[model samples]
Target: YDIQAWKKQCEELLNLIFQCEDSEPFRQPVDLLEYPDYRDIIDTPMDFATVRETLEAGNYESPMELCKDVRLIFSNSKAYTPSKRSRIYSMSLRLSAFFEEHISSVLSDYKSALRFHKR
Candidate 1:
């Protein structure tokens, strides 16, 4: 029930965001490449609990560094084949851009709200 409500709220916000003039579609066309075999670039099984625990001990002051730390998990892993790395790199760049644009606006507003509340 809560998950459905959350998704409904998210959909409404996404709809509003899409209506804004600055919104633009991702450029990569769907037909550009024949869909690659899924098995060719499968993710290496990971013990994320250990990964998270280790990372939790470190302090990161910036989002960029945090992103780098997360990427390092995959990039440094023995299981990530070159093709898998390339596929993740390509998708992450586009996804990062989309997330930054949409979330930054809300975060900026939140920062302003915090400032106002302090006054």
Candidate 2:
């Protein structure tokens, strides 16, 4: 699933969103991408007992890694596929994908800034 690449993409897009906020197109509802839907899915409490136990034992540092794991699960969940299952599940997954792409674009801007700051 290229999960690591996906995470990096998301990081980029988030930085782009932040940049656009200062440049002129500074408004929410970023696009018709419906990326905001991902926020709602994230709002639902995640059952993290299993992950919490594992991470606590290993000194994983930040929950950021846990979020990555959850994002992978969300990305590949059958909940996002076509079936007799609820449509909301698929839509949510698609929405998350959109947000991921948006974040990647943002992160590109972040990298650009870092390069500038370094030089």
lDDT of 1 by residue, 1-119 (tens): 12112223333434543453322221221122443542354343222233333335544333343335434433433233355446544554544455456545444554465557676
lDDT of 2 by residue, 34-65 (tens): 44354444433232243344454664433355
- The TM-score values for the models, in the order shown, are 0.35, 0.33
Candidate 1: lDDT of 30?
Answer: 17
> Which TM-score value belongs to model 2?
0.33
Q: Which candidate is the best by TM-score?
A: 1
lDDT of 1: 0.39
Residue 50 lDDT in candidate 2: 36
Worst 10 residues of 2 by lDDT: 21-30
Off by over 4 Å in 2: 1-73, 76-86
